[PDB]
UniProtKB/Swiss-Prot annotation, chain A:
GO terms for cellular component: cytosolic ribosome; cytosolic small ribosomal subunit; nucleolus. It comes from Oryctolagus cuniculus. The modification N6-acetyllysine is found at residue 56. It is found in: Cytoplasm; Nucleus, Nucleolus. Keywords: Acetylation, Cytoplasm, Nucleus, Phosphoprotein, Ribonucleoprotein, Ribosomal protein. GO terms for molecular function: RNA binding; structural constituent of ribosome. Component of the small ribosomal subunit. The ribosome is a large ribonucleoprotein complex responsible for the synthesis of proteins in the cell. Part of the small subunit (SSU) processome, first precursor of the small eukaryotic ribosomal subunit. During the assembly of the SSU processome in the nucleolus, many ribosome biogenesis factors, an RNA chaperone and ribosomal proteins associate with the nascent pre-rRNA and work in concert to generate RNA folding, modifications, rearrangements and cleavage as well as targeted degradation of pre-ribosomal RNA by the RNA exosome. This is Small ribosomal subunit protein uS9. Gene3D superfamilies: 3.30.230.10. GO terms for biological process: maturation of SSU-rRNA from tricistronic rRNA transcript (SSU-rRNA, 5.8S rRNA, LSU-rRNA); translation. PANTHER family: RIBOSOMAL PROTEIN S16, RIBOSOMAL PROTEIN S9.
Curated annotation (Swiss-Prot), chain D:
Keywords: Acetylation, Cytoplasm, Host-virus interaction, Methylation, Nucleus, Ribonucleoprotein, Ribosomal protein. GO terms for biological process: ribosomal small subunit assembly; translation. This is Small ribosomal subunit protein eS19. InterPro entries: Ribosomal_eS19, Ribosomal_eS19_CS, WH-like_DNA-bd_sf, WH_DNA-bd_sf. One of its GO terms (molecular function) is structural constituent of ribosome. PROSITE patterns: RIBOSOMAL_S19E (PS00628). The gene is RPS19. The keyword Ribosomal protein applies. It comes from Oryctolagus cuniculus (Rabbit). It is found in: Cytoplasm; Nucleus, Nucleolus. Component of the small ribosomal subunit. Part of the small subunit (SSU) processome, composed of more than 70 proteins and the RNA chaperone small nucleolar RNA (snoRNA) U3. Interacts with RPS19BP1; the interaction is direct and mediates the integration of RPS19 in state post-A1. Interacts with RPS19BP1. The modification N6-succinyllysine is found at residue 141.
UniProtKB/Swiss-Prot annotation, chain G:
Component of the 40S small ribosomal subunit. The keyword Calcium does not apply. The modification Phosphoserine is found at residue 8. Its main location: cytoplasm. Component of the small ribosomal subunit. The ribosome is a large ribonucleoprotein complex responsible for the synthesis of proteins in the cell. It is found in: Cytoplasm, Cytosol; Cytoplasm; Rough endoplasmic reticulum. One of its GO terms (biological process) is cytoplasmic translation. This is Small ribosomal subunit protein uS14.
From Swiss-Prot, chain H:
Belongs to the universal ribosomal protein uS7 family. Component of the small ribosomal subunit. The ribosome is a large ribonucleoprotein complex responsible for the synthesis of proteins in the cell. Part of the small subunit (SSU) processome, first precursor of the small eukaryotic ribosomal subunit. During the assembly of the SSU processome in the nucleolus, many ribosome biogenesis factors, an RNA chaperone and ribosomal proteins associate with the nascent pre-rRNA and work in concert to generate RNA folding, modifications, rearrangements and cleavage as well as targeted degradation of pre-ribosomal RNA by the RNA exosome. Its main location: cytoplasm. CDD domains: uS7_Eukaryote. One of its GO terms (molecular function) is structural constituent of ribosome. Keywords: Acetylation, Cytoplasm, Isopeptide bond, Nucleus, Phosphoprotein, Ribonucleoprotein, Ribosomal protein, Ubl conjugation. Component of the small ribosomal subunit. Part of the small subunit (SSU) processome, composed of more than 70 proteins and the RNA chaperone small nucleolar RNA (snoRNA) U3. There is a cross-link at residue 34 (Glycyl lysine isopeptide (Lys-Gly) (interchain with G-Cter in SUMO2)). The modification Phosphothreonine is found at residue 1. InterPro entries: Ribosomal_uS7, Ribosomal_uS7_CS, Ribosomal_uS7_dom, Ribosomal_uS7_dom_sf, Ribosomal_uS7_euk/arc. One of its GO terms (biological process) is translation. This is Small ribosomal subunit protein uS7. GO terms for cellular component: cytosolic ribosome; nucleolus; small ribosomal subunit.
RNA sequence: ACGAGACUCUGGCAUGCUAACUAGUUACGCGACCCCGGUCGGCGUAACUUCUUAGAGGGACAAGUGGCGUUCAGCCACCCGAGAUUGAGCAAUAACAGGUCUGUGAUGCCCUUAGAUGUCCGGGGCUGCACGCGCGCUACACUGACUGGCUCAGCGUGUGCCUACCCUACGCCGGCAGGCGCGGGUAACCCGUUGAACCCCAUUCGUGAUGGGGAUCGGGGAUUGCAAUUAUUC
């Protein structure tokens, strides 16, 4: 029917994860491979918080094709969390009302604020005279 | 299979060199001089010898089947770049020594360097670092 | 550690002693006023100067200021 | 129906190793039994047909991104050159062990050359690769 | 007919004002215009010692060159652009016209 | 210092001390049965793979670094 | 005789074949970007070639 | 399940917090539920942002120790997740309850300090800091040069700490520190 | 009056503005493959700026409330919020016998100036080793080593006025170092979608100076250079 297109971007430490939604059926897959088929597979329950704290019925009318690039291993895993949780918010704003959308934001606000508000932490610059951002070289007396 | 069999071995005194029987075959052979780890796996590959067993199940007549490859790897299609003595100075015999010739050939290249008054060999006489190491700050234990 | 200096305070009194009717109470209101009645060179100072004006307005409505 | 992308990759690289068991006609080289994978390694691998394992990983890598040549194969199959006394550097794989796989899969038609160079997967090789992608998924359901 | 003009400079105010003034001469003749593409900037990096000899505490430098480039396409002949490339040019901007 | 002379391969009593006594423990891992029965860690794992085909231990978590075993279900 | 034993070394490589253009010494040379200038001659003339200590 | 949470397969509910002195510093229930013992971070910036952290994540945050294993949270969660079953296959009960009796019983009440030493009381947040710490370095030597893996030593000690059986490192160092404080008290 | 502040560059938020066939996406249309749907850095197209990039702007002020404070300067707390202190640069008055005449065609003064402390060519040394000291690196293992598999980046540089000397894909030859033939990149183009490690998964080892450690040292092979022996590296 009508083209219900939502493409929500969400950053991470460096990682860029962009979605693209449509009125589909219950399939969620990132870069073509599904979300449980992402290694490391110890973080498998970290990609089901939008699936579990909302329920599967929120994705009965939603398909999402996620393009991700950049970052690290864990940085990608956290980028692909806040990029699809935010995506279903805008799909439940442009097309359905916000009273059915605030009922899935108030659940999202009591667990973790990273899913909707990204981290403003960025790695500080290493200065001269030290191996790290704050660490200086070992001083020798005498 | 699982329990200690009969004809068990703890020590394989082969090529007058003691080989422990507790380890895996491909890693027990490192006791012999002239064989480390990489040369050890491939010689076990040049015959169909099982290596997921220990050094205490392998039968007797085929540990000699190991040996026929050991001193002569040439006729069992092992290349020259595996050898510890490639292109020998006198005859050009691409050979492999195993705990007999190694120290025996070792007191020859000393005098092939010492008689000829070579700068490389003179450091072996004194016992200093020969490969061009900074000697001012390192190597203190051996020299007092 | 947020203590204003003279140029935040000597200027903000010139905003009050000459432009009283042209301001209100809300910050962003007289922030948008002070840009046109005063040439402040930077943006961060533009938020700085007007920020002291609203705080002193919270005093003038409540009492006399020296 | 499902493709290779619906399958966990850990139990895929031995699945394609199983399809070459019924083949036995890849003209496997001679020095495979006494060779190290790369200069950053120092041993040989553990499985006897590791050449049936590393070749089994190339076709799925050529599924994801094609036109890859001999220099693009050594980077992915390389590893950390643990230099020991020095801090480490990264090291690519051996050039020949990649060149003998893309020559093994030119013996049997499973890979073609891309225009302006490269090595990419063929459609009839994508026919039967989507058959071993079913034998893994139908077994775990 | 598809001509490309490069706009590259150092000072941001020197390149931003001349890109728009060259747009102003383009709409007057009302021709096939393209907009300004802003490619990522190149920054030359030099960090060196402050001291001439090797005495004192160790302090370094932060020399920078944030150079910027803009390209503009036109479906215009080489004649009418030569009436625009003769006006409104500041010497800090480097222009190389690509005929084809 | 002190030698932990582990058994490289079983005896006829030690393996017989495995077919009945290991299914009595509540915790079976290659790090304790090798220490409780003085065998190598290689022999420890290779003492339980047959028990899978013997069905005298139950697997609940196999991993790269950690595999644990127990009794069977009590019934 | 003479002329074949004064510059007869190969002078196409090495640090005896490169030098500064301003300081004319062979230490601390900035051979980056075709600068070819010593690092102390770089400091005083950093404004003349155009550099700015922006950071 | 948007109503209840399963820690992998471990239930969120039925953990009674015994001590009332630490229950305001154990964030373990109904407001602090996570499927993983891993968040993005952010807990270590403010003064008292360390009080509402999930305790199982706190132990992993303290486990990545001694150089080579710093910055490797990907595998210490692979240690405690394996170690949680080890507690269950020895007890049969909730393994997280064993941790509750572990941090309760391994936190010293009084502690001498440089003032001549004056033995003084400690904060509950100091107490949960030390109780989680003394076990975390105790198992660090139990797997050191030993066939017993780090997964078991992490699981073995809090089992021995929930009963206070005094064969763990954390119990011994708690009562000696309470006694050497009892000297100059 | 200076310094502090302010100021600058960067870090974070703006589905608003401006536009991108050397940036990406969205579709549509085939090709391939599985049972309409599924996938593809396979291939073209018109709409877009979400991601690409950087231009303008906008955004935070102790602003609002609640305590606290002369109720002044201010401080503590809450909420809304992408931010309720990003990081650096710049940095005074006066001072040191701090250091550099080995950065100079910056130099006073002094020595030397043809059998030259000037200049170049050969070779050696600056690496030399009873000993003490400083910054370091890899380690001392099982949270490990070792072997397969799986999979993630972000900063830069590249054909030189001299300069005869570049970054590199691809195709073969060889276990490797390396070698040969074509093509592109003066660069958001080619390298490069920069397939980095750590990692993750699964083997193997099993508390043993062991498969931890790689110091020492012998033998063979290639690159750079006119030249590597005092082992240039590999």
């Amino acid at each position: 029917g009508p083209l219900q297109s939502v493409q929500v971007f969400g950053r991470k430490k460096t990682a860029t994860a962009v979605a693209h939604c449509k009125r589909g059926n219950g399939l969620i897959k990132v870069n073509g491979r599904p979300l449980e088929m992402i290694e490391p597979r110890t973080l498998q329950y970290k990609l089901l918080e939008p699936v579990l704290l909302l329920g599967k019925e929120r994705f009965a009318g939603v398909d999402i094709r996620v393009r991700v690039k950049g970052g690290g291993h864990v940085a990608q895993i956290y980028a692909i969390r806040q990029s699809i949780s935010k995506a279903l918010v805008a799909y439940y704003q442009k097309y359905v009302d916000e009273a059915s959308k605030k009922e899935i934001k108030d659940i999202l606000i009591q667990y973790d604020r990273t899913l909707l508000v990204a981290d403003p932490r960025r790695c500080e610059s290493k200065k001269f005279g030290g191996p790290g951002a704050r660490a200086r070289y070992q001083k020798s007396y005498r | 299979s699982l329990v200690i069999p009969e004809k068990f071995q703890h020590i394989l005194r082969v090529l007058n060199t003691n080989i422990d029987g507790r380890r895996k075959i491909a890693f027990a052979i490192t006791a012999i001089k002239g064989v480390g780890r990489r040369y050890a796996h491939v010689v076990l590959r040049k015959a169909d010898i099982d290596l997921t067993k220990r050094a205490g199940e392998l039968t007797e007549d085929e540990v000699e089947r190991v040996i026929t490859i050991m001193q002569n790897p040439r006729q069992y299609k092992i290349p020259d770049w595996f050898l510890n003595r490639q292109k020998d100075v006198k005859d050009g015999k691409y050979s492999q020594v195993l705990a007999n010739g190694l120290d025996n050939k070792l007191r020859e290249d000393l005098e092939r360097l010492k008689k000829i008054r070579a700068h490389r060999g003179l450091r072996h006489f004194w016992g200093l670092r020969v490969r061009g190491q900074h000697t001012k700050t390192t190597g203190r234990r051996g020299r007092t | 550690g947020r203590v204003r200096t003279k140029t935040v305070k000597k200027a903000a009194r010139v905003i009050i002693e000459k432009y009283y009717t042209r301001l209100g109470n809300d910050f962003h209101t007289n922030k948008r006023v002070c840009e046109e009645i005063a040439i402040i060179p930077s943006k961060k100072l533009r938020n700085k100067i007007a920020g002291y004006v609203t705080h002193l307005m919270k005093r003038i409505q409540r009492g006399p200021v020296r | 129906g499902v493709t290779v992308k619906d399958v966990n990759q850990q139990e895929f690289v031995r699945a394609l190793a199983a399809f070459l068991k019924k083949s036995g006609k890849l003209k496997v080289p001679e020095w495979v039994d006494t060779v190290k994978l790369a200069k950053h390694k120092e041993l040989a691998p553990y499985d006897e047909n590791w050449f049936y394992t590393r070749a089994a990983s190339t076709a799925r890598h050529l599924y994801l991104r094609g036109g890859a040549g001999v220099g693009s194969m050594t980077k992915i199959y390389g590893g950390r050159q643990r230099n020991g006394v020095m801090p480490s550097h990264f090291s690519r794989g051996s050039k020949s062990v990649a060149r003998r796989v893309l020559q093994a899969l030119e013996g049997l038609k499973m890979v073609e050359k891309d225009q302006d160079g490269g090595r990419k997967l063929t459609p009839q090789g994508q026919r039967d690769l989507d058959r071993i992608a079913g034998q893994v998924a139908a077994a775990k359901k | 007919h598809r001509i490309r003009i490069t706009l590259t400079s150092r000072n941001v105010k020197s390149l931003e004002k001349v890109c728009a003034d060259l747009i102003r001469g383009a709409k007057e003749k009302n021709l096939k215009v393209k907009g300004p593409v802003r490619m990522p900037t190149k920054t030359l990096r030099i960090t060196t010692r402050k001291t001439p000899c090797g005495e004192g505490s160790k302090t370094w430098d932060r020399f920078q060159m944030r150079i910027h480039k803009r390209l503009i396409d036109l479906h215009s002949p080489s004649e009418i652009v030569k009436q625009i490339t003769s006006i409104s040019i500041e010497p800090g901007v480097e222009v190389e016209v690509t005929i084809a | 210092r002190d030698k932990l002379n582990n058994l490289v391969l079983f005896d006829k009593a030690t393996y017989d001390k495995l077919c009945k006594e290991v299914p009595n423990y509540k915790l079976i891992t290659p790090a304790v049965v090798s220490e409780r029965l003085k065998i190598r860690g290689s022999l420890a794992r290779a003492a339980l793979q047959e028990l899978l085909s013997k069905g005298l231990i139950k697997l609940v978590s196999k991993h790269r670094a950690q595999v644990i075993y127990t009794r069977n279900t009590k019934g | 005789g003479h002329q074949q034993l004064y510059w007869s070394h190969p002078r196409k490589f090495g640090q005896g074949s490169r030098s500064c253009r301003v300081c004319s010494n062979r230490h601390g040379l900035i051979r980056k970007y075709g600068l070819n200038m010593c690092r102390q001659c770089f400091r005083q003339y950093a404004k003349d070639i155009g550099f700015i200590k922006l950071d | 399940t948007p109503d209840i949470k399963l820690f992998g397969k471990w239930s969120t509910d039925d953990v009674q917090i015994n001590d009332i002195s630490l229950q305001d510093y154990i964030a373990v229930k109904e407001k602090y539920a996570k499927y993983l013992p891993h968040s993005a971070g952010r807990y270590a910036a403010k003064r008292f942002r360390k009080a509402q952290c999930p305790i199982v994540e706190r132990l992993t945050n303290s486990m990545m120790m001694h150089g080579r294993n710093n910055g490797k949270k990907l595998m210490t969660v692979r240690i405690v997740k394996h170690a949680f079953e080890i507690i269950h296959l020895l007890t049969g009960e909730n393994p997280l309850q064993v941790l509750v009796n572990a941090i309760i019983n391994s936190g010293p009440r009084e502690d001498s300090t440089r003032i001549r030493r004056q033995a003084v009381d400690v904060s509950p947040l100091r107490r949960v800091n030390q109780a989680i710490w003394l076990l975390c370095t105790g198992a660090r030597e139990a797997a050191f040069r030993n066939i017993k893996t780090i997964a078991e030593c992490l699981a073995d000690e809090l089992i021995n700490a929930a009963k206070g059986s005094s064969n763990s490192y954390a119990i011994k160092k708690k009562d000696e520190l309470e006694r050497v404080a009892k000297s100059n008290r």
